[PDB]
Amino acid sequence: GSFTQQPDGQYLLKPCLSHRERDFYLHIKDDKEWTGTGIIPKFYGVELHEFGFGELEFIRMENLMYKYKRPFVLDLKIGTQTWDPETASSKMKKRLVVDSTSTTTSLGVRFSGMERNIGEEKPILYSRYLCTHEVNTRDSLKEYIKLFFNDGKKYRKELVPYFISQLDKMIEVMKKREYKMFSSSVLFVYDSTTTLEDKKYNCKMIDFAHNWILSEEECTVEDGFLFGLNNLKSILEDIENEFKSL
Numbered sequence: 001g002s003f004t005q006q007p008d009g010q011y012l013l014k015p016c017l018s019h020r021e022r023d024f025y026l027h028i029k030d031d032k033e034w035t036g037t038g039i040i041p042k043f044y045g046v047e048l049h050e051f052g053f054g055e056l057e058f059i060r061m062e063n064l065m066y067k068y069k070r071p072f073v074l075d076l077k078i079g080t081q082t083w084d085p086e087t088a089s090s091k092m093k094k095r096l097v098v099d100s101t102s103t104t105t106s107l108g109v110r111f112s113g114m115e116r117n118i119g120e121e122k123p124i125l126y127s128r129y130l131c132t133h134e135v136n137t138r139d140s141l142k143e144y145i146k147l148f149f150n151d152g153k154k155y156r157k158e159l160v161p162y163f164i165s166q167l168d169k170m171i172e173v174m175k176k177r178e179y180k181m182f183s184s185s186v187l188f189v190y191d192s193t194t195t196l197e198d199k200k201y202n203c204k205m206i207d208f209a210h211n212w213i214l215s216e217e218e219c220t221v222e223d224g225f226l227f228g229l230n231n232l233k234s235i236l237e238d239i240e241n242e243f244k245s246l
C-alpha cells in the first residue's frame with residue numbers, strides 16, 4: 001500500500017516507512033547466502049530522495065517482472081501468525097481471525113492474491129481475501145497454486161522444479177534462526193511467453209517491514225516461517241506428482 005502496486009521498469013523504489021525492512025536488507029547485504037543465492041530481490045541500496053521538507057529513505061531493488069509480456073503473479077504470505085510484537089491493538093482481532101480462518105495457523109502459509117494474464121487482458125485478478133473462503137484448506141491452496149501454473153492453454157509443469165529449488169535455498173538459510181519475519185511473502189512470478197531458457201520466472205522472499213534481527217533485539221513470539229516454507233515445498237512436490245498424470 002506504500003506505492004501503486006502495478007511492472008515493466010527496471011526497479012522498485014520502495015519508501016522506508018520504518019527501520020525494519022531497510023535494516024534487514026543492510027544486514028544481509030554482505031552475506032553471500034542471502035545475496036548470491038537469488039532468494040530475495042537484488043538490493044541496489046538505500047537512497048534518500050527529496051520528499052516533503054527534506055528527504056525520505058527508499059530501498060532500491062529489482063523489479064522482478066521487468067520486461068514481462070504476460071505476467072502471472074501469486075503472493076503467498078508465510079508464517080503461522082501475521083501479527084508481531086509491534087502490531088497495533090486495533091488490528092489484532094482481525095489478524096487473529098484471518099490467521100485462524102485461513103491456512104496460516106495450520107500450514108504456516110496462505111494464499112494472498114493472484115493475477116493471471118491469459119490473452120484477454122486486462123488480466124484475471126484473484127483477491128487476497130479468498131484465503132478465508134475459497135482457499136482456506138491445503139487442498140484448495142494446492143488447487144490455486146496449480147491455477148497459477150495454468151497459463152490459459154496448459155499447465156507449465158516444467159517451471160515447478162525451479163520453484164522448489166528456490167524454496168530449498170530459502171529453507172537452508174532460514175534454518176539458521178537469525179531473523180524472524182512476519183507478514184512477509186514468497187512471490188511467484190513468470191511471463192507466460194517465456195521459455196525455460198529465457199528465465200522469465202522468479203521466486204523470491206519479499207516484504208520485510210516486520211523483520212526482527214535476533215542478534216540485535218528480542219522477539220519472543222514465533223513466526224513459524226520455516227514450518228510454512230516446508231509446507232509450501234510439500235505442496236509444490238505434490239503438484240509435481242499430480243502434473244505427471246497429464
Ligand SMILES: O=P(O)(O)O[C@H]1[C@H](OP(=O)(O)O)[C@@H](OP(=O)(O)O)[C@H](OP(=O)(O)O)[C@@H](OP(=O)(O)O)[C@H]1OP(=O)(O)O
Pocket residue numbers: 001002091094098112128
Ligand atoms: O487495516 P489493516 O488490517 O492493516 O488492513 C490492510 C491494509 O488495508 P487498509 O489500509 O485498507 O485497511 C493495507 O494497506 P496499508 O494500510 O498497509 O497501506 C493492505 O496492504 P496492501 O495495500 O499492501 O495490500 C492489506 O493487505 P495485505 O497486507 O494482506 O496485502 C490489509 O490487510 P488485509 O489484507 O489483512 O486486510
Ligand SMILES: Nc1ncnc2c1ncn2[C@@H]1O[C@H](COP(=O)(O)OP(=O)(O)OP(=O)(O)O)[C@@H](O)[C@H]1O
Pocket residue numbers: 001002003005007012041061062063064065073075187206207208209
Ligand atoms: N521487487 C519486486 N518486484 C516486483 N513486484 C514486487 C516486488 N516487491 C513487491 N512486489 C509486488 O508489490 C506488492 C507490494 O509490495 P510490498 O508488500 O513489499 O510493499 P507495500 O505493500 O507497499 O508495503 P509494506 O511493506 O508495508 O507491506 C507485492 O504484493 C508484490 O505483488
Ligand SMILES: [Mg+2]
Pocket residue numbers: 001002
Ligand atoms: Mg503492504
Ligand SMILES: [Mg+2]
Pocket residue numbers: 183207
Ligand atoms: Mg505487507
